[PDB]
Amino acid sequence: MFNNEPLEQIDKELHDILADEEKRQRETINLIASENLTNGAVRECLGNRVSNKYSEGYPKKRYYGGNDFIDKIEELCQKRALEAFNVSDEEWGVNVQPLSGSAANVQALYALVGVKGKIMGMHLCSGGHLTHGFFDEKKKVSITSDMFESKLYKCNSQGYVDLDAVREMALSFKPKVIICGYTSYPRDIDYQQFRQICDEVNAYLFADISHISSFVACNILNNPFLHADVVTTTTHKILRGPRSALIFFNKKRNPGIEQKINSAVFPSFQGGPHNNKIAAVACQLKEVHSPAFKEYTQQVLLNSKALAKALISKQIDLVTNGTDNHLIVVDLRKFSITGSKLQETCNAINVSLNKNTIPSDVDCVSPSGVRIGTPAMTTRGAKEKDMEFIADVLARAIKITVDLQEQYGKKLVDFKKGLPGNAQLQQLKQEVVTWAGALPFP
């Protein structure tokens, strides 16, 4: 009693929007630092009938039966996660059930501290994620500021984590958890100095490496596994897997954390795991460990470095004046334009990036920068020499944004009126589509 007609036949409306989405992805210079492109195998997993199975619980301790093949999949994903990050299954455990990064963090935080528990994270404007306790004066924006008591440490004016500030805050606030690893931080992290501060105040060290996971696995950036109690990461960014998350916990430093984290994921928070996600993660984790993937990750940093260099050579200011990782934040103050304006300009030429706060920014509406990243285009074959072109297109968008603000005004409503039909933009879009459309596309 089912219709087995293909997607194109059964739902033509939806199939066209998705064909379009596909065409837009193919013809874009994607610099969203948090995005990547999945290969066909990861998408086969995601489309696999294994998502039919309810398998609440954990492997060999399942509530239901018929989970023999599911257990094999889940255990393989756990094995390969521990492998990929070069930790021993005797010292480290991992939970592969969190449905996405925000869930993984709320779950992992609750395991450690509980309701009304105290946590410290980096402020949103400085590079922290919403799930690191974000709130504003007007409201508790994140559940992690409401279901927990949260405190937020800022970076200095130059855009670096100020560890003096982190200690001053940890001693007076006395949190049970200190979170590090970030959404828009362009530099590496001193986990040892975090570990040192946590040890002092008897807090857990929590490292969210979602943005830089590949660097950590491939031994290119600092390893928080040598110091952290918990490591969280999404699997869909630089790691290039499906949309899912992994919670890692150090058993030796905190015995009985396994039970706390596993029970927090289920049954505290989630219900049935999504086994298609688990399959897809397991698949990408095989690839993560190959020496080929280390090469891709190396190319990511080589590209980021060269993009940063080319932008500085065009008199564009970056926060921290560069990058240790896949990401760069442009400081646009010298050009007297917002990140929101540049974003719109860039979307009009099929350049995908996001607006982003800088240190001097008081508020998150009208931020003074954009964030760019190399994982997506590095996945599409672009190399160091190709970054001069991306730098050139971004320079041209900035210039056009300045001209348009002059002609149509500073109000965003007015500015946007300038965008459609603009001869130069139409021209620049053409240049972008021609270069992007011909690149390899998984």
Ligand X SMILES: Cc1[nH]nc2c1[C@]1(C(C#N)=C(N)O2)c2cc(N3CCC(CC(=O)O)CC3)cc(F)c2CC1(C)C
> What is the footprint of ligand PLG within residues 175-234 (CB under 6 A)?
181-183, 208, 210-211, 234
Active site residue 56: yes
- Quick check: helix, strand or coil at residue 170? helix
Q: How many angstroms separate the CA atoms of 19 and 306, rounded?
A: 33
Minimum CB distance to ligand X, residue 235 (Å) = 17
Residues that bind ligand X (CB under 6 A): 56, 63, 124, 127-130, 141, 183-184, 267, 271, 354-357, 364
Active site residue 237: yes
Site residues for its own copies, 248-267, by CB under 8 A, read 267
Active site residue 191: no
CB 207 within 8 A of CB 181: yes
Minimum CB distance to its own copies, residue 226 (Å) = 27
Binding at 127: pick from ligand PLG, ligand X, its own copies, none (beta carbon under 5-8 Å per type): ligand X
Which among 163, 158, 159, 128 is positioned nearest to 142, based on CA atoms? 128
Active site residue 361: no
Site residues for ligand PLG, 264-293, by CB under 6 A, read 271-272
Q: How many angstroms separate the CA atoms of 257 and 51, rounded?
A: 29
Q: Which of 276, 325, 368, 405 binds its own copies (CB under 8 A)?
A: 276
Which two tokens mark 9?
Answer: 């036949």
Active site residue 131: no
| x-marked contacts with ligand PLG along 32-61 as a string, rule CB under 6 A | --x-------------------x-------
Count Cβ neighbours within 10 Å for each residue of 163-202 and write b for 16 or more, e otherwise: eeebbebbeebebbbbbbbbbbbbbebebeebbebbeebe
User: Is residue 78 at the binding interface for its own copies, with CB under 8 A as the rule?
Assistant: no
Calculate the alpha carbon distances from 4 to 10, 16, 40, 49, 239 in Å: 8, 19, 22, 14, 34
Alpha-carbon Rg for the chain, nearest whole angstrom, is 22
Binding at 208: pick from ligand X, ligand PLG, its own copies, none (beta carbon under 5-8 Å per type): ligand PLG
Per DSSP, the chain holds a count of helices (H) and strands (E) of 17, 15
**Where is 207: in which H helix or E strand?**
strand 204-208
User: Is residue 143 at the binding interface for its own copies, with CB under 8 A as the rule?
Assistant: yes
Minimum CB distance to ligand PLG, residue 25 (Å) = 16
Active site residue 295: no
User: Is residue 92 at the binding interface for ligand PLG, with CB under 6 A as the rule?
Assistant: no
Which among 329, 331, 401, 339 is positioned nearest to 360, based on CA atoms? 331
Q: Which of 27, 35, 208, 287 is labelled catalytic?
A: 208
Q: Which of 43, 54, 75, 416 is labelled catalytic?
A: 54
Binding at 304: pick from ligand X, its own copies, ligand PLG, none (beta carbon under 5-8 Å per type): none
Do strands 177-180 and 230-234 pair parallel, antiparallel, or not at all (unpaired)?
A: unpaired
Q: Which of 26, 44, 53, 56 is labelled catalytic?
A: 56
Binding at 43: pick from ligand X, its own copies, ligand PLG, none (beta carbon under 5-8 Å per type): its own copies
**Which residues belong to the active site?**
54, 56, 208, 234, 237, 243
